[PDB]
């Protein structure tokens, strides 16, 4: 499936570091159901022109962008092309590449349990459940003290993005190891057909 | 701004002087791939993705030509106004649980980067390492600045301290982000 790119319109002609940035965002709500398409032209951290499918045409965001916006909306071949990208790019890429790529990626998490400081029965300690290398983001981690789910004393980091299409999250559980106790870490993720559970006998 | 999924396509960045360009595709905040302007090919982050989907390199080259031109125009149209430098922050953390004597990846996440021209290098015991170092492209941020990630392949030794050294015009001197197993 060939990925389609948003095209940038050429600007009308009229130490010191300058940065120009173009981009076409495609917001998909409820799959392909609702789609909003926005392209932004940015000069030095400043968005000076843009196309919003909710508006139906280029609109300068600052005086620097009036020339461009004026011109692009005048030539029918340019406005109609940009305007069509909502189907030409967004919808196409979503129903094609994405659907067969990121939209179906499932990476089961690896979970392990660790004790912060060395174990000393009848002494407070910390239990950490590390859930790593999973995808997509949606995930649930629950702690269990031999049978029953505990929420108090439980603390979790925020979703950490590894940058290579995987996430990780850490979940601490404050507790004190008493012989005969069994702590288990439950993790539910879309990639698993059945919840994963790691045990740690005190 | 509110959506189950966001696909940013054709992200083109260009800067002067030096003619430094970048062309990438992202999805839900992850790079699908980028186009090497020199080798003139498409590099997919997840190689398994390039098997299923493709993208002709010509597309990025062509789009970089436009953006290159627009910078020229917009530069003059504003009396050559300089970009305001920013101070980039760093954060270091392991890709998976640290287990001595076991291959792992140390990650350096640099945020608030602008302009998108930076040097991120590692240091083992203040000795500087250059092997097993992969770097991502610049990712876009809502406030129009960027972030990048650097990865370091390493084996957690008992006593070897690492540092993510960052060099940016927004800093009077490099900032070292320290990370230690214990």
């Amino acid at each position: 499936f060939e990925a389609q790119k948003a095209k940038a319109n050429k600007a009308v002609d009229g130490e010191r570091h300058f940065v120009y940035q173009f981009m076409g965002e495609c917001y998909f709500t409820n799959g392909t159901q609702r789609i909003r398409y926005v392209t932004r032209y940015i000069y030095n951290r400043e968005e000076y022109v843009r196309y919003d499918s909710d508006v139906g045409e280029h609109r300068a965001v600052t005086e620097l962008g009036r020339p461009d916006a004026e011109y692009w909306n005048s030539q029918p071949e340019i406005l109609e092309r940009t305007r069509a990208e909502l189907d030409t790019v967004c919808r196409h890429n979503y129903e094609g590449p994405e659907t067969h790529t990121s939209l179906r990626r499932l990476e089961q998490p690896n979970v392990v349990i660790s004790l912060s400081r060395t174990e000393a029965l009848n002494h407070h300690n910390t239990l950490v459940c590390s859930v790593t290398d999973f995808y997509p983001a949606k995930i649930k981690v629950r702690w269990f003290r031999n049978g029953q789910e505990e929420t108090v004393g439980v603390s979790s980091t925020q979703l950490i993005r590894n940058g290579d299409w995987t996430f990780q999250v850490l979940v601490m559980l404050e507790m004190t190891p008493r012989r005969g106790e069994v702590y288990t870490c439950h993790v539910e993720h879309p990639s698993l057909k059945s919840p994963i559970t790691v045990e740690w006998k005190a | 701004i509110e959506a189950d999924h966001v696909g940013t396509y054709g992200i083109s960045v260009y800067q002067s002087p030096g003619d430094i360009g970048q062309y990438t595709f992202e999805f839900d905040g992850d790079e699908l791939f980028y186009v090497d302007l020199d080798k003139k090919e498409t590099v997919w982050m997840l190689p398994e993705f390039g098997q299923l989907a493709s993208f002709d390199p010509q597309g990025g080259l062509q789009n970089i030509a436009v953006v290159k031109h627009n910078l020229g125009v917009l530069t003059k149209r504003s009396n050559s106004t300089p970009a305001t430098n920013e101070a980039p922050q760093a954060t270091v953390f392991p890709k998976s649980p640290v287990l001595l004597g076991q291959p792992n990846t140390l990650i350096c996440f640099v945020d608030n980067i602008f302009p998108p021209v930076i040097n991120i290098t590692w240091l083992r015991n203040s000795k500087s390492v250059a092997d097993g170092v992969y770097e991502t492209s610049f990712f876009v941020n809502r406030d129009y600045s960027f972030h990048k990630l650097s990865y370091l392949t390493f084996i957690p030794s008992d006593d070897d301290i690492y540092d993510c050294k960052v060099e940016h015009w927004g800093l009077e001197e490099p900032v070292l982000k320290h990370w230690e197993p214990e």
Partner: T-cell receptor
Amino acid sequence: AVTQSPRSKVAVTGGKVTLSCHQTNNHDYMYWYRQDTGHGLRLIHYSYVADSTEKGDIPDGYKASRPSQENFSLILELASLSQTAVYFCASIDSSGNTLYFGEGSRLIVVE
Amino acid sequence: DSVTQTEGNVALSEEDFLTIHCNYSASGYPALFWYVQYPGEGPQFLFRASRDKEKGSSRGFEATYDKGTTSFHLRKASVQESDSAVYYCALVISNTNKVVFGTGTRLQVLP
């Protein structure tokens, strides 16, 4: 807009021909198509930048040169009987997708 | 990834109904065109359609972008004898800005 040269040209097999194309529309993209009844228009080479070129569907037997952004040359180092056709040069605005052809350059290759 | 025109040669009396079928195959969501070439010159732009259900028209000629049956059939109510020429169906691969042409249909409008 786009003018072609020569309007026509007879050549001997093995001979070297050069079809030149000039454009005023001030476009980045310039193409070269060959026309022959039973095949419509097929792309030989195309260019979007002042120093490069790219192959189309049937570039075999041809070379192109984009010295400037308004001049695009099509070269046949060694004429062939199967290269007898009508060559059309065209252009497009990088921000558009509409082609602008020239009058054409008929080329006959005799034995 | 190409374009196909059903006919290849059409002849009819002035004031008749004209219909030239055109079907396509693309990897993306291409912009569909129609070009016309009058005897003794290059092909020129007629009109376009950037997406499904959209309608392109000009000089009496019109076509509707049909993504469903991947079509773009040309049509005119009453053809005039000055419409005799070659009509091409085109397609634009937006990623590399290449334009694929159909075979072309020759239209003969008997006065």
